[PDB]
Design a protein around this ligand. Structure first.
Ligand SMILES: Nc1nc2c(ncn2[C@@H]2O[C@H](COP(=O)(O)OP(=O)(O)CP(=O)(O)O)[C@@H](O)[C@H]2O)c(=O)[nH]1
Ligand SMILES: Nc1nc2c(ncn2[C@@H]2O[C@H](COP(=O)(O)OP(=O)(O)CP(=O)(O)O)[C@@H](O)[C@H]2O)c(=O)[nH]1
Ligand SMILES: [Cl-]
Ligand SMILES: [Cl-]
Ligand SMILES: [Cl-]
Ligand SMILES: [Cl-]
Ligand SMILES: [Cl-]
Ligand SMILES: [Cl-]
Ligand SMILES: [Mg+2]
Ligand SMILES: [Mg+2]
Ligand SMILES: [Mg+2]
Ligand SMILES: [Mg+2]
Lengths: 210, 210
């Protein structure tokens, strides 16, 4: 079970000022392109699952992931996930011919899980690409070694900004994180939906901050 | 403050069997070359500080770090660190001419901290390379999203194996980790020294397991 705190920033200016506030803690910044896949009939969507191939920078690194049955409440996320780095060349071949996905990913634990739990045809001739989106992620090592991820997410239809923190102590870290945003004067709200959900919805959540 | 659990495995066979036990959780495996730097007079060593430039795989990624005043007790590590990814080309230029380190790293927060807290000459004409060592690191996402790092560390003089876990709950996670190694039959002891300390010592800690 993967547990994260997820807060949304309202605006470029809030993202700018938080970015400046965290700059003493900066570890790295990288570009991600996230692509998603499913059967033509949407079998994974029907069981609340998301299959993502993520490319870092200029095809430098590639990560395959299956994420299943997410829950989100009061800024706290829980989700079942299984992910693994793969050869970016294979990730690109999958993107080019997703009907070959089962043969291309035949040795993957992740592809094996897609088959064993959703019953899709083992060869993957059914799979299609859903499209995707771009994201700039700046990573910070904060108090107690906590890792903060500040995202600038460019969908086809708009831009959103979030800050997130993976932790085993969601209630106490979320208090820490909220307390820091208040003291630095950074408006925020709890994220109401994942980036995948926002992508599929085709529009930005209404930004209900007040 | 960075907190990690650090356990040492005695043997190749223990490393093999733990590697197999964690394979359902495997996220990535990468090759690291760690190089270290100090003044000729050892000013950083005198204040209990370690300056490392780490290269990943074939000069693919580079990380600069300053680590200061480490503590280690009962398998639990605390250390003050500040690190940041840098252009591998610059990391290599520093390696080639460490007497140019201050001009090469002039914009780094980390180099700035070396100067501001140890008073070294700002231009770095005093710095020399201490050498380094190689490490293969396999990364796992385990229960509650905890990240386990299983290391195979090749010093000039011998090989050591460790497993480590960064956490905000050291006492409870260490119980979890010890409990899993027992149930899988993996001998282990608490790590008695960091890889940097072992490197500088020039020999392997006596492996006092019994
Ligand atoms: N130590 C460590 N942690 C990692 C690594 N990769 C990912 N993580 C952890 O998992 C998260 C980022 O990877 P991921 O599982 O894809 O989460 P995500 O889908 O990007 C978060 P969101 O859905 O909101 O965009 C982070 O919360 C991070 O703490 C890693 O290489 N090392
Ligand atoms: N989410 C996340 N965590 C990271 C990332 N990089 C490092 N970490 C965390 O910091 C540790 C690895 O980097 P580092 O600070 O150099 O520790 P180290 O010096 O390699 C540990 P040792 O000294 O025993 O070899 C891990 O414990 C990890 O959880 C990252 O990119 N993302
Ligand atoms: Cl603002
Ligand atoms: Cl990143
Ligand atoms: Cl996503
Ligand atoms: Cl053994
Ligand atoms: Cl690694
Ligand atoms: Cl080290
Ligand atoms: Mg996750
Ligand atoms: Mg994931
Ligand atoms: Mg550390
Ligand atoms: Mg460090």
């Amino acid at each position: 079970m993967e547990i994260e705190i997820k807060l949304r920033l309202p605006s470029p200016s809030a993202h700018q000022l938080l970015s400046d506030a965290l700059s003493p803690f900066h570890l790295k910044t990288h570009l991600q392109h996230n692509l998603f896949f499913d059967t033509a009939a949407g079998d994974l969507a029907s069981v609340f699952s998301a299959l993502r191939i993520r490319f870092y920078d200029a095809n430098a690194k590639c990560v395959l992931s299956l994420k299943s049955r997410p829950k989100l409440s009061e800024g706290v996320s829980h989700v079942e996930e299984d992910e693994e780095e793969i050869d970016p060349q294979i990730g690109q071949e999958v993107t080019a011919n997703p009907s070959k996905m089962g043969s291309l990913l035949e040795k993957s634990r992740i592809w094996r899980r897609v088959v064993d739990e959703i019953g899709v045809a083992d060869d993957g001739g059914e799979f299609v690409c859903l499209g995707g989106f771009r994201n700039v992620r700046a990573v910070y090592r904060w108090v107690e070694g906590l890792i903060l991820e500040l995202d600038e997410t460019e969908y086809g239809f708009g831009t959103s900004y979030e800050i997130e923190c993976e932790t085993t102590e969601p209630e106490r870290v979320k208090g820490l994180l909220e307390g820091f945003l208040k003291e630095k004067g950074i408006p925020y709200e709890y994220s109401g939906a994942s980036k995948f959900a926002v992508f599929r919805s085709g529009k930005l959540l209404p930004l209900e901050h007040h």
